[PDB]
Amino acid sequence: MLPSYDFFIHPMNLVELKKDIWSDSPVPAKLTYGKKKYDIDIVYRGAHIREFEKKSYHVMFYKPKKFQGAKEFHLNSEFMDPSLIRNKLSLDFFHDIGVLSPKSQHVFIKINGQIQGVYLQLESVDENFLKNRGLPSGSIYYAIDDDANFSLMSERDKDVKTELFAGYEFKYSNENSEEQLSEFVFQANALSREAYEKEIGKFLHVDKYLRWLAGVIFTQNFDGFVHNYALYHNDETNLFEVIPWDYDATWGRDVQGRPLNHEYIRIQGYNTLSARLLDIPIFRKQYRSILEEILAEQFTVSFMMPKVESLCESIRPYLLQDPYMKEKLETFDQEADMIEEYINKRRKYIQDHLHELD
Ligand SMILES: [Mg+2]
Ligand SMILES: [Mg+2]
Ligand SMILES: [Mg+2]
Ligand SMILES: [Mg+2]
């Protein structure tokens, strides 16, 4: 049974929200969940997903200050995804392969008494994300533009970046956050091949980076190497790791919603940091071992498809009650087989190319 959320948005505030859908200015609202009521602020989120009648929302809790351990969450329509499950499937997969990852759950929402349908509630990657995992304080940075590429170089300027911390929103930060990020970006690029094995681990959690890279390769987020992630600098270990975000264009479909034909991602992935690490024999062997471990445990039909089937079964009766989705249950139903075929094809490609890491 999906959690049912009943939102109230006062008509005056709803007019303001609908006046400029591109605005990032929130309006007050209320959430009722069971018997408990929450004063909140709500705003549309995303870019192209604002064009849909089934809008996506960023919900910020005001009073009470927290909802199930969080001060905010995201409500995605996942309308581009005919399955509504690829983002959850992906982010849970990252968790299962040992990468820090947002939790998510499907929910059923109403606004002002009118069903809006099935949404994916996504955890905000912020200080509560850390606290709820027992993780140390530190900094969280969101990749927001092309300068979040792990390089010294700005593509647009065709020159060295003016600031090496460029490309990120500082979501949770302190006085050291800029310099910590700048140092990481600089050292990722400035350490020689001969110094890399002994020194990159002073700045980067290499195993967690390689597991994130593996996750991008397995899910095939074509834009996942320089976008669609957050960085976390753990202040106790002094190391960076990478947290995925926005993984709906995965498991056999691209960002336009189209089935992949013969499009694929090479197993080495992309971005300069990946390239520098995979020039190091120890790290190439480590990465190969990670891919083999995941191929043996998580990235299999036997293991993934029960999760696909459980997600679909849990939301299907609610999709029939969703005014935007009620007509495309047949297409929805066909997505499990598409994902299964993708796993089989992707497994074969990765297995066939592991020798490139030798
Ligand atoms: Mg608040
Ligand atoms: Mg550090
Ligand atoms: Mg996207
Ligand atoms: Mg190389």
From TrEMBL:
<feature type="binding site">
    <location>
        <position position="61"/>
    </location>
    <ligand>
        <name>Mg(2+) 1</name>
    </ligand>
</feature>
<dbReference type="InterPro" id="IPR014867">
    <property type="entry name" value="Spore_coat_CotH_CotH2/3/7"/>
</dbReference>
<feature type="binding site">
    <location>
        <position position="45"/>
    </location>
    <ligand>
        <name>AMP</name>
    </ligand>
</feature>
<keyword id="KW-0946">Virion</keyword>
<feature type="binding site">
    <location>
        <position position="142"/>
    </location>
    <ligand>
        <name>AMP</name>
    </ligand>
</feature>
<feature type="binding site">
    <location>
        <position position="279"/>
    </location>
    <ligand>
        <name>Mg(2+) 4</name>
    </ligand>
</feature>
<dbReference type="Pfam" id="PF08757">
    <property type="entry name" value="CotH"/>
</dbReference>
<feature type="binding site">
    <location>
        <position position="169"/>
    </location>
    <ligand>
        <name>AMP</name>
    </ligand>
</feature>
<feature type="binding site">
    <location>
        <position position="238"/>
    </location>
    <ligand>
        <name>Mg(2+) 2</name>
    </ligand>
</feature>
<dbReference type="GO" id="GO:0000166">
    <property type="term" value="F:nucleotide binding"/>
</dbReference>
<keyword id="KW-0479">Metal-binding</keyword>
<feature type="binding site">
    <location>
        <position position="233"/>
    </location>
    <ligand>
        <name>Mg(2+) 2</name>
    </ligand>
</feature>
<keyword id="KW-0547">Nucleotide-binding</keyword>
<feature type="binding site">
    <location>
        <position position="246"/>
    </location>
    <ligand>
        <name>Mg(2+) 3</name>
    </ligand>
</feature>
<feature type="binding site">
    <location>
        <position position="245"/>
    </location>
    <ligand>
        <name>AMP</name>
    </ligand>
</feature>
<protein>
    <submittedName>
        <fullName>Spore coat protein H</fullName>
    </submittedName>
</protein>
<keyword id="KW-0167">Capsid protein</keyword>
<dbReference type="GO" id="GO:0046872">
    <property type="term" value="F:metal ion binding"/>
</dbReference>
